[PDB]
Amino acid sequence: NGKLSEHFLYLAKELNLTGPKVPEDIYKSHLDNSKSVFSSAGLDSAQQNLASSFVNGFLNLGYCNDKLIVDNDNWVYKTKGDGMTSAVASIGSIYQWNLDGLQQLDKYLYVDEPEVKAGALLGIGISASGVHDGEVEPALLLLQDYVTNPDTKISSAAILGLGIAF
Amino acid sequence: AQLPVGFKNMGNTCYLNATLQALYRVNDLRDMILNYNPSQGVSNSGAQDEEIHKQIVIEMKRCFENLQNKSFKSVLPIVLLNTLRKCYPQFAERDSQGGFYKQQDAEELFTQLFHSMSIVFGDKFSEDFRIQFKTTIKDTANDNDITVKENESDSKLQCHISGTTNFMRNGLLEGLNEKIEKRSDLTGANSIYSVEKKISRLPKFLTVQYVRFFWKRSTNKKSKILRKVVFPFQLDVADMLTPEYAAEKVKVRDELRKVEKEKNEKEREIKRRKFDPSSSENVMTPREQYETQVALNESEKDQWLEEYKKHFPPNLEKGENPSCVYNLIGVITHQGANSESGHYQAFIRDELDENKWYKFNDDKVSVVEKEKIESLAGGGESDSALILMYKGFGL
């Protein structure tokens, strides 16, 4: 980009296509075929109560609709401990490789526990990977503010996040 | 209730262990023992060893409470044994390590224990083991002479397995044909008598003692009758019962059948719950749900037993079995012909599942089946019954 942008046959299409924005778009077409699932696996009670939540994430690799499962705040607050952190990050993994599904994560970022704030930031990292040269919703916009907050857990999720997304 | 466990051994007390677990598993017997306090005293002052007999009973209390406990495989039989030596010189006998006691005949121990409970409780303990017989005494050569006893009775029935036998069942028949001779020829010669007993009144609890220890004359050794026997799980005694007594028993048995089915109906519904996981309750092992269910079951079973007993006619007398069927609850088996240092093993039918049995090889617990006990060939090839303990159905 700059060679292409100097010629200016079209500015936008070339930037998008050099950038990873077109790689986000082709996948959207693909998902429909492979079939969008709300499928979860994992069992209740004890340390599996933590697992089942996380596992929904891993099973919904790449960009997938699992919007309605996520929309329940029940499952998220039902996780315990440090496991709460991993839950919010894994919601980002449902929405891996794509901006769309930011909104659910932002909610966690403001509310309750220090634990879920760190989780929200890590997950926003995982999701925003589908950009680095589209420069459409930069990672930097979200991620600056939490470096400044001196709490160690919050900052750590966030400055690792920057590393992944760009 | 709570599962039975290891019974502390310490060498040469094998026989002693086996008999004690055996008595415990009888439901009635356990409670009376638990409910024994020295305040109620001996119910007979006909015995100069009245105080000692109280003391035994108390040490068995100790043992029983601890046996039940899943925690304690200790029961401390060190003191109990000491007490036995004082009470009876049979048990002071036989040189050994530490005290003098060693391995013995579980048959000897069982008769002596029996009197101990009998004196403390009185006639209540007794009626629950009294067997009446209408005994006909006919000389084989003089059949014409027939002398009849109607008030003959005994606490214990002998199964003779000497003479042609292949089964416990056959041996119960041969056991009625004891043979005795009589110096009088006013009863017709010095010939053997056929002595034929029919049981005209059953006790709640039936004790079978194998008679089989003898000195084999020809080899000049202690021996025991080597002949095969096989003991079926379910016993039926309908043939030995005099017809007139038998009819009443078949009718009673039917009310009992109904309860046995409602007991096994709600039993199945237990197994399902455990099979499934615990689902949501959140950061919990399944184990905590599960223990609770195990507790329900033990309660439900005692409750079902009480239903059989309440439903029995008020015509039924205490010290009569309701029925003609009995269920096998305890097998004291013996191994080795010598009992001078033979070894005793114990099989005890599991409480929580009657279906299952625990083999208690002294302290050491291993799981076996009810079937495994049926499949025994008996004799000396395998462990073989010396004392069998039989429990009236539903008690």
UniProtKB/Swiss-Prot annotation, chain A:
Q: Where are the PC repeats?
A: 86-118, 119-156
Q: What else is known?
A: Present with 306000 molecules/cell in log phase SD medium.
Q: Which family does it belong to?
A: Belongs to the proteasome subunit S2 family.
Function according to Swiss-Prot or TrEMBL? Acts as a regulatory subunit of the 26S proteasome which is involved in the ATP-dependent degradation of ubiquitinated proteins.
**Name of the featured protein:** 26S proteasome regulatory subunit RPN1
- Native source species: Saccharomyces cerevisiae (strain ATCC 204508 / S288c) (Baker's yeast)
The organism that produces this protein has a lineage beginning with:
Eukaryota, Fungi, Dikarya, Ascomycota, Saccharomycotina
Curated annotation (Swiss-Prot), chain B:
* Basic and acidic residues compositional bias, start-end: 261-270
> What is catalysed by this protein?
Thiol-dependent hydrolysis of ester, thioester, amide, peptide and isopeptide bonds formed by the C-terminal Gly of ubiquitin (a 76-residue protein attached to proteins as an intracellular targeting signal)
Instruction: Kindly state the subunit structure of this protein.
Output: Associates with the regulatory particle (RP) of the proteasome.
Write the protein's name. Answer: Ubiquitin carboxyl-terminal hydrolase 6
Report the superkingdom from the record: Eukaryota
The pH profile of the activity is:
Optimum pH is 8.5-9.
- Keyword annotations: Hydrolase, Phosphoprotein, Protease, Thiol protease, Ubl conjugation pathway
Q: What does the record's free text say on domains?
A: The N-terminal ubiquitin-like domain is required for proteasome association and UBP6 activation at the proteasome.
Q: Which is a GO BP term held by this UniProt record?
A: negative regulation of proteasomal protein catabolic process
Region annotation (Disordered) ranges: 261-287
Can you supply one Gene Ontology CC term for this chain's record? proteasome complex
What does the record give as the organism's lineage?
Eukaryota, Fungi, Dikarya, Ascomycota, Saccharomycotina
* Molecular function per GO: cysteine-type deubiquitinase activity; proteasome binding
Job description of the protein: Predominant proteasome-associated deubiquitinase which releases ubiquitin from the proteasome targeted ubiquitinated proteins. Ensures the regeneration of ubiquitin at the proteasome. Has proteasome-inhibitory activity and delays the degradation of ubiquitinated proteins to provide a time window allowing gradual deubiquitination of the substrate. Stabilizes the association of HUL5 with proteasomes and works in opposition to polyubiquitin elongation activity of HUL5.
Which of the residues bear the PTM Phosphothreonine? T285
Activity control, as annotated, is: Activated by it's association with the proteasome.
Q: Which residues form the USP domain?
A: 5-393
- This chain's source organism reads Saccharomyces cerevisiae (strain ATCC 204508 / S288c)
Query: So where's the catalytic machinery, residue-wise?
Result: C14 (nucleophile), H343 (proton acceptor)
Phosphoserine occurs at S366
From the entire protein, which fragment is shown? 105 to 499 of 499
The UniProt family comment states: Belongs to the peptidase C19 family. USP14/UBP6 subfamily.
Q: What is its EC number?
A: 3.4.19.12
Q: What is the additional note?
A: Present with 6770 molecules/cell in log phase SD medium.
